[PDB]
């Protein structure tokens, strides 16, 4: 599914999103943004490494969830890739927190240092009432 915006910024919120390990909302907004354009069933192989990024946060099939194909690959999710193709977010949620559990944080997403790093992400989350 392709969420809308502040439909998007409220489900974030709701999922105890909103400063998470110090992130804003905006901040997870922008990352979503980038990394899928808000679409659960966004997916991005990646041939040099033989990996995946799966669903609205593209998270890599290397270290964080298990798709039995990648080679040498760990599950720090403890989820199938699977799980982070659905509609509903809450496992993927689950899954981005652990990632910026992290010593990295928000960081381990280049596309978030890239796109929102030192950028007026405000934009994100006007008129969504979070």
């Known amino acids: 599914?392709?969420?809308?915006?502040?439909?998007?910024?409220?489900?974030?919120?709701?999922?105890?999103?909103?400063?998470?390990?110090?992130?804003?909302?905006?901040?997870?907004?922008c990352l979503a943004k980038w990394e899928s354009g808000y679409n659960t069933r966004?997916?991005?192989y990646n041939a040099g490494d033989r990996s995946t990024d799966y669903g609205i946060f593209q998270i890599n099939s290397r270290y964080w969830c298990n798709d039995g194909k990648t080679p040498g690959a760990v599950n720090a999710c403890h989820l199938s890739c699977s799980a982070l193709l659905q509609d509903?977010?809450?496992?993927?949620?689950?899954?981005?927190?652990?990632?910026?559990?992290?010593?990295?944080?928000?960081?381990?997403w280049v596309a978030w240092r890239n796109r929102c790093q030192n950028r007026d992400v405000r934009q994100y989350v006007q008129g969504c009432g979070v």
Do not use: H
């Open 1 to 29: 599914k392709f969420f809308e915006r502040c439909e998007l910024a409220r489900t974030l919120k709701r999922l105890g999103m909103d400063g998470y390990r110090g992130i804003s909302l905006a901040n997870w907004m």
């Open 42 to 44: 966004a997916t991005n």
């Open 88 to 108: 509903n977010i809450a496992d993927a949620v689950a899954c981005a927190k652990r990632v910026v559990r992290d010593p990295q944080g928000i960081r381990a």
